[PDB]
Amino acid sequence: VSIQAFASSSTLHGISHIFSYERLSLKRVVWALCFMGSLALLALVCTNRIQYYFLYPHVTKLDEVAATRLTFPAVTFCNLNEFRFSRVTKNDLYHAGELLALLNNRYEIPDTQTADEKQLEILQDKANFRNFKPKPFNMLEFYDRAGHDIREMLLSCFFRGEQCSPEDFKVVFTRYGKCYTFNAGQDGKPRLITMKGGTGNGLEIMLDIQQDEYLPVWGETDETSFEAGIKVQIHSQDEPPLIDQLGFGVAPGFQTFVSCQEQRLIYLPPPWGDCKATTGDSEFYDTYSITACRIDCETRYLVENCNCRMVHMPGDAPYCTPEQYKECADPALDFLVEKDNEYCVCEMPCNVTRYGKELSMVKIPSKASAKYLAKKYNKSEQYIGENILVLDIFFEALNYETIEQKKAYEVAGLLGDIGGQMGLFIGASILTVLELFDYAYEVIKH
Amino acid sequence: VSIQAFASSSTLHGISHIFSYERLSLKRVVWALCFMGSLALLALVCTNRIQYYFLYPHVTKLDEVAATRLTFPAVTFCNLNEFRFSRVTKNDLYHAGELLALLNNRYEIPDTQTADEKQLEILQDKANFRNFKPKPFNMLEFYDRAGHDIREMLLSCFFRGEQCSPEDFKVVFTRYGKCYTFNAGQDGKPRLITMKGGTGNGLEIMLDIQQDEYLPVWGETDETSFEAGIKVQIHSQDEPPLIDQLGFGVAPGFQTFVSCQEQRLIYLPPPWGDCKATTGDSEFYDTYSITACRIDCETRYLVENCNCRMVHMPGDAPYCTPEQYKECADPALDFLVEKDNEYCVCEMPCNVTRYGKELSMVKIPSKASAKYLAKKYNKSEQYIGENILVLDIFFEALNYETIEQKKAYEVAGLLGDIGGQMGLFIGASILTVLELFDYAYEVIKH
Amino acid sequence: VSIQAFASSSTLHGISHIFSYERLSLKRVVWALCFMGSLALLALVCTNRIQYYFLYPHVTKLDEVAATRLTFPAVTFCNLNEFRFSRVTKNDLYHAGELLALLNNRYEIPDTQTADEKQLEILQDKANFRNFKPKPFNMLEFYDRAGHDIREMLLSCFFRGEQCSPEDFKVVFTRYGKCYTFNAGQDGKPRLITMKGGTGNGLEIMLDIQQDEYLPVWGETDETSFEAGIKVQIHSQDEPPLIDQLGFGVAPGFQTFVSCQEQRLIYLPPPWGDCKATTGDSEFYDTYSITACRIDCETRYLVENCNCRMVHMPGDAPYCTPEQYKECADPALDFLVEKDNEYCVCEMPCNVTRYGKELSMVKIPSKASAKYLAKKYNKSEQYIGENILVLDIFFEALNYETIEQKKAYEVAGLLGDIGGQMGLFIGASILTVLELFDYAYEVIKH
Ligand SMILES: *[C@@H]1O[C@H](CO)[C@@H](O)[C@H](O)[C@H]1NC(C)=O
Ligand SMILES: *[C@@H]1O[C@H](CO)[C@@H](O)[C@H](O)[C@H]1NC(C)=O
Ligand SMILES: *[C@@H]1O[C@H](CO)[C@@H](O)[C@H](O)[C@H]1NC(C)=O
Ligand SMILES: *[C@@H]1O[C@H](CO)[C@@H](O)[C@H](O)[C@H]1NC(C)=O
Ligand SMILES: *[C@@H]1O[C@H](CO)[C@@H](O)[C@H](O)[C@H]1NC(C)=O
Ligand SMILES: *[C@@H]1O[C@H](CO)[C@@H](O)[C@H](O)[C@H]1NC(C)=O
């Protein structure tokens, strides 16, 4: 009933000395200030732990090991030329001549041409449209036919001692045209694995970029460039290539060693981080990713503005006219990748695989082996230094790395902190504060 | 009063069974050893948590995301030649001839010269000092005038589809001479941003290193080297370039793709780590950094030893004579960057921005576009393969990374551990040990 | 005795209101459900912390600083040729001619040879075995003698301003043959240190790959390749080189800048991670490592299958015949590094040092310094662009990095969580549950 009788039986550690059955003394002012000193200091450290919880903190866990049974990625490579010079016919020069800067606006050879005594004559008799009635023309058939063929570029391929074939590369269409992907993982083919590190457990491709098949550059367009070589992108199996933006280049006349390292990044869902479902809802792909978020940007943009998609874009929209490349599709796509700040926002998925790589080159051929490669492939010694290219893609020793975001402070650790801090200063529980509310309920009713 | 009366009311969980109102039995020896067993085991786990706190531990938090509105850094590039050959006059050869290894100690052409039939004759009639009365000469005017000009090297520049100009590069003086910085961020110009990854949201510079303007190398000095190309440093806006030590090189005749990734590093102050104030007190710079700590090393050293500063050093000290470069300033600066172990210690700041990069090259020009660039810039086809250089600097998809050091164990988590460990073994609080001191104060007074 | 008398004195916070000396009311059903509600909710958060402990979790600690007194690593480089052409004698061509694809199976020059009018005549009069009685022949003497000599390749070497010598490189035998290691750390030589970052605190080697000494390639073997240059491996002092698998290449005619960063990786022993003792038991090396685990794989494999070891393999097994290279040792070693999935498993050590590097190249020579290097080394201007090679290996500013795995949840933090969670919900200790077992022991005996 009385406060002296309640504080004797209660489970607060300090109140029994404050409300004892004695007179007022030096003790009752030094027990009360130690109790109110411990009650106020409890509120500072419990506010510190509750406000730390609702920030939802998280730390990282970076394992970097030498894993086995590691899946070899997909390697997409594109020749920097888009079309072979000997495959461009008279019908192809009629429709896509102004796009390739080979004709004027009046279907004739420009006066500012840069060609020798031979390639000018080959272009002058197939740009003769005296009795030319035009035939129909599609761009997808023209990238497929006039592009570079893998049965002529691929001189040798070895993956882990086993010889490749030109039927091991899958034809993919990018902005560079007819491109090829090793270890695409599609068409029912199983995926290839690597066990250890080094050049022996990797890919080795010897190519031929065929500079004699390059069509002459007479202007600055989006289909003719000033360079020679290939561009390579090493990406995951479930990710489409974005090789015009995210690819590295390989020069002819060199053997390029590409030492990779697979880095898997795992994030947290809200309220700790950001996660869209990685096997979520992309419009034309099964696995959501950053590059799959950017391709259906570009597909939705070009269909909205000029009613057509390019040949490297999915969907059922019609392909663009060769005039609609020059007028609509090239400046609208150049607006997205360069000057656009607002149209594309992409939510981060929480399975992102990154391949960090280190490139190095030696010179091919030496003076000793120059005459052997000229006879082996029926070529000249001037051809070999200009065109032959070897690419080595492999993993290092520490080939696997995981960067995982993990929760730093959970609800079971929150109750362990605020249960020890309640017990340290006053020694109470949640059944103590219900015993305080029981005496508060008794003092109102009487 | 009695110990049996005190232990009945006290809040230690074990002492009431030890001092009960009974005879000695098997219980009083098994309650006391469980209490002294829990009292001694409390001291082992509370010592483990207090000694863990005063080590001041910390863990890391590595976020690696694809950020937007990301600020494009500053790009400083220097041609590997210091002076153009057609800008060196007769007065310049008189004073700085022995420095450039073009004259002997008696102001005449050395007998061990390596020049052809034309560049030797051009040097023989401007090294004729028969009636030459010398004029005054400053080195800062000679790096500024005889250095390479950006209105002749810069053939084209594009940043995110927008064309650059030669007025977009800021003249900075380094040890290589007259150098240029894109996106310097100074002079009231706002800083440029990038949104996405890829080559379209980056910089593209086509240069001309001008090997016909290289002055001939006749010896091994600190101003003439054996190489050709440029050196580039990609640094932050608030950081001076140290391009002679920390720059990467770019070769002529190639298109170099530089795929970067911004990495921001945040550390902890003492007693957890090391922090000088990043906007602290550097002698000639506002933001403290590692390179700003090294330049005022080199400025304070050369003024102390030989009373002059070089042209790339701040302050109000006089510039060095061309003899004081050869005698004082070059071996004293070569002592600091190479053989010095004691003069410079730099406290680590805790905002360090690092740009990790991956380089790749294709060949420029191809055989198709060689004749077009020769006519476009009024040059020869031999000139284009030797001198033309294209540089692409861009960000990848995962372009942003934060490595932040965070405290692993604080004072609110320390009281939650030692408050639960006191409560687990004996069930006490800090008001329990004041109840023990109250009975100790009563037993002395009576 | 009674349950009302026991619950009044006990230290469970809720049981005294359940078993009071009153009648049944609304309170006895609301004290019991709050006690059994707090008793059941205690079991959910204590199971969450005990099951979290026995997963043995761990987080990481990534420090990335600019350390001083940092030890410079070992640099192993191998020329891509194995044997000099002018050192192959008539006895050497008799035994190891078919291995080098210079002879048929009947000891004569093949009809499909690729050589000019001079190197064919030099091979035709030393492949004349008309009166040739054969002499004995060992392969270790043939890699040592006919390999490339460092007193002819090394044109200059500087480490931190101090000039190297050819006696500073240690001869190591790899699969490429006679190879050399700078800063090997053996033979009583102290290890070299670096203080700051930049090219001045690093190594600078000017080489001569000697393409006039390359023996002609007439086929595809494991000792003759199509390339020219060197391969370099930057490894630790206590680690053998694996340069045929884990080395990067450097091309002639370029100055390669290699900007490194030392990364030290520390793991945890079981049950938290995986540790073999790093100074454990390798069969032929003192410090256990990944590459030392792979070399005694390859040594144990070849001795088991074809009774001999190659010249780059330790032990006391006999060296292989030049026929046993072609028949046994080359396809058995090509099976291990390429197609083997089961023979080698290597337990991870927990001191792994990794050197992450960034390569960049400028062109050597320029047109100005081409005639000087031709006269300095008594060579032609055609020789200098094909053969001269400069390599710069240095550290960056943030040259040191530590990735340490640290335990996230220990036994002293487990008792602090489950001691606060016991105290928060019921306010009990381990001396409370012994007071419950004391009343359970009393109710059985009476
Ligand atoms: C994401 O990765 C984790 C671990 O690699 C895996 O368990 C999970 O299934 C993945 N989610 C996907 C692929 O949607
Ligand atoms: C080899 O090349 C020549 C010239 O290109 C060609 O005429 C010939 O058909 C090719 N093939 C063979 C087997 O000679
Ligand atoms: C350091 O960085 C943090 C976060 O980037 C920022 O809040 C702080 O103002 C910076 N300190 C400086 C620039 O002195
Ligand atoms: C082009 O180059 C030549 C030779 O270098 C020069 O004489 C001429 O003035 C230049 N300009 C034009 C417009 O021809
Ligand atoms: C492993 O590294 C740690 C820290 O670098 C060191 O203390 C320990 O002695 C090392 N163990 C070895 C070399 O066996
Ligand atoms: C220089 O080279 C030539 C031709 O290789 C040689 O005959 C001569 O001995 C070499 N040395 C000197 C000092 O001329």
Residue numbers in the entry:
A (entry chain B), B (entry chain A), C (entry chain C): 17 to 462
Sentences from the paper on this structure:
ASICs, and by extension, members of the ENaC/DEG superfamily of ion channels, are trimers, with each subunit composed of large extracellular domains, two transmembrane (TM) helices, and intracellular amino and carboxy termini. Upon activation by rapid exposure to low pH, homotrimeric ASIC1a channels open, exhibiting modest Na+ selectivity with PNa/PK ~ 7.8 and PNa/PCa ~ 18.5 and subsequently entering a long-lived desensitized state in hundreds of milliseconds. Chicken ASIC1, an ortholog of mammalian ASIC1a, is, from a structural standpoint, the most well-characterized member of the ENaC/DEG family of ion channels, with X-ray and single-particle cryo-EM structures of the detergent-solubilized channel determined in the resting, open and desensitized states. Here, we present structures of cASIC1 solubilized without the use of detergent, using SMA copolymers, in distinct conformational states at low and high pH.
While pH50 for cASIC1 is ~6.7 (29, 31), extensive 3D classification of the pH 7.0 dataset did not indicate the presence of either open or resting channels. Accordingly, we speculate that our cryo-EM reconstruction is representative of the long-lived desensitized state occupied by cASIC1 channels following extended exposure to low, but sub-threshold, pH conditions. At pH 7.0, cASIC1-SMA particles prepared at pH 7.0 populate a desensitized state that mirrors the overall architecture of the existing X-ray structure, including the presence of a proton-bound ‘collapsed’ acidic pocket. In accord with previously solved structures, the homotrimeric ASIC1 channel resembles a clenched fist, harboring domain-swapped TM2 helices. Both the desensitized and resting channels adopt closed ion channel gates, as evidenced by a constriction between residues 433–436 within the upper third of the TMD. The pre-TM1 residues, from Val 17 to Leu 40, form a reentrant loop comprised of two short helical segments (Re-1 and Re-2) separated by a turn, positioned on the cytoplasmic side of the GAS belt. The ‘lower’ ion conduction pathway of resting and desensitized cASIC1-SMA channels is formed by reentrant amino terminal residues Ser 24 through His 29, the latter of which is situated below the GAS belt and is oriented towards the threefold axis where it forms a constriction below the gate in the desensitized channel. In our 2.8 Å reconstruction of a desensitized ASIC1, we observed multiple ordered elongated densities situated in hydrophobic channels along the TMD that we suggest may correspond to bound lipids. Separated into spatially distinct clusters, putative lipid densities reside near the top of the membrane sandwiched between TM2a and TM1 helices and near the cytoplasmic side of the membrane, between TM1 and TM2b. Furthermore, the size of the lower constriction formed by His 29 (radius ~2.1–2.6 Å) is unlikely to accommodate hydrated K+ ions, indicating a potential contribution to ion selectivity by a simple steric mechanism.
